[PDB]
Amino acid sequence: STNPPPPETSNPNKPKRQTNQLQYLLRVVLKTLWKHQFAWPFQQPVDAVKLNLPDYYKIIKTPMDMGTIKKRLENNYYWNAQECIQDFNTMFTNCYIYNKPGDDIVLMAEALEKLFLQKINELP
């Protein structure tokens, strides 16, 4: 029983810019979602061992969580705001892929996704 290593949070061989939008995604957008009531299943990588979901990292080929996004932002990992946005989109979409419509985690992810889209809409 072992979960795969979490996604990389630092990479030397990668284009890396430090912009105001990436700074905004960390200070405002991610901090808002982080303090939301539904944040707790997404702040860490999915623990398929404790949740008894042996098919997760086997159905989902590009896992993503807000904890990885956060460490990547704090490491100036992203090339621009769009690469970080793709991680948010990938995280929400992974939830919709693995789980069924109407499931508790899907309804939580849809509420966080709407708040995410409303925040990043007010972007420089």
How many Å apart are CA 71 and CA 9, to the nearest integer? 6
How many Å apart are CA 87 and CA 117, to the nearest integer? 13
How many Å apart are CA 110 and CA 5, to the nearest integer? 26
How many Å apart are CA 72 and CA 77, to the nearest integer? 5
**Which token pair is 70?**
């956060």
DSSP the chain: --PPPPPPS--SSS-----HHHHHIIIIIIHHHHTSGGGTTTSS---HHHHT-TTHHHH-SS---HHHHHHHHHTT--SSHHHHHHHHHHHHHHHHHHSPTT-HHHHHHHHHHHHHHHHHTS--
Task: Please check whether residue 46 is in contact with residue 56, taking contact to mean a CB–CB distance below 8 angstroms.
Answer: yes
How many Å apart are CA 111 and CA 105, to the nearest integer? 10
Give first-to-last CA distance, the chain, whole Å.
Answer: 45
How many Å apart are CA 87 and CA 79, to the nearest integer? 12
**Which token pair is 32?**
């808002």
Read off the amino acid at residue 75.
Answer: N
How many Å apart are CA 66 and CA 44, to the nearest integer? 7
Experimental resolution (Å) = 2.7
Extents of the domains making up the chain: 19-123
How many Å apart are CA 16 and CA 80, to the nearest integer? 8
